[PDB]
Design a protein around this ligand. Structure first.
Ligand SMILES: COc1ccc2c(c1)N(CCCNC(=O)c1cccc3c1N[C@H](C)CC(=O)N3)CCC2
Length: 126
C-alpha cells in the first residue's frame, strides 16, 4: 500500500487567527519537544512504506505528527489552542494503540508526552 496523503496544513475555507496560547504552543511547547532526542520519529507523518508498517494505516485512521502540527501553527491553521493540544494527544494515542507497550517507540512517546503535559500546564491565560 501507498501512504495516505498527509493531514491538511492549510484550508482556504477555514477561518484563521493567532492567539496568545497558539503563539505559546509554537514558540515554547513545540520548540521544547522538537529538540528532544526522541522527537525524530514524530517530526513527520508516519511513512508506513519506508518503515515497513503495512497495517499502520489499517489500524490508525487519525494519523497526526509534530511536523503537521508545526505547519498548522505556522499557517495559523488552528482557531483554538484546544485543536492543537488535541493533535498532540492524537499523536501520542496513536502510538499507544498501534505498538506493544514495551516497544522503544512507546517508551519514547511516554517521555515526550510527559514533557508535553508539563509544558501545557504552563500555558498562559487566554
Ligand atoms: C523518520 O524518518 C526516518 C527515515 C529513515 C530512517 C528512520 C526514520 N529511522 C528511525 C526509525 C524510527 N522508527 C519508527 O518511526 C517506527 C518504527 C516502527 C514502528 C513505529 C515507528 N514510529 C512511528 C511513530 C509509527 C509507530 O507508531 N511505530 C531509522 C532508519 C532510517
Amino acid at each position: 500500500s501507498m501512504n495516505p496523503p498527509p493531514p491538511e496544513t492549510s484550508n482556504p475555507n477555514k477561518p484563521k487567527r493567532q492567539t496568545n496560547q497558539l503563539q505559546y504552543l509554537l514558540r515554547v511547547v513545540l520548540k521544547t519537544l522538537w529538540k528532544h532526542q526522541f522527537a525524530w520519529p514524530f517530526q513527520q507523518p508516519v511513512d508506513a512504506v519506508k518503515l515497513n508498517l503495512p497495517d499502520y494505516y489499517k489500524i490508525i485512521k487519525t494519523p497526526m505528527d509534530m511536523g503537521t502540527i508545526k505547519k498548522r501553527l505556522e499557517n495559523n491553521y488552528y482557531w483554538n489552542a484546544q485543536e492543537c493540544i488535541q493533535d498532540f494527544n492524537t499523536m501520542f494515542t496513536n502510538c499507544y494503540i498501534y505498538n506493544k507497550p514495551g516497544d522503544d517507540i512507546v517508551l519514547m512517546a511516554e517521555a515526550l508526552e510527559k514533557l508535553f503535559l508539563q509544558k501545557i500546564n504552563e500555558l498562559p491565560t487566554e
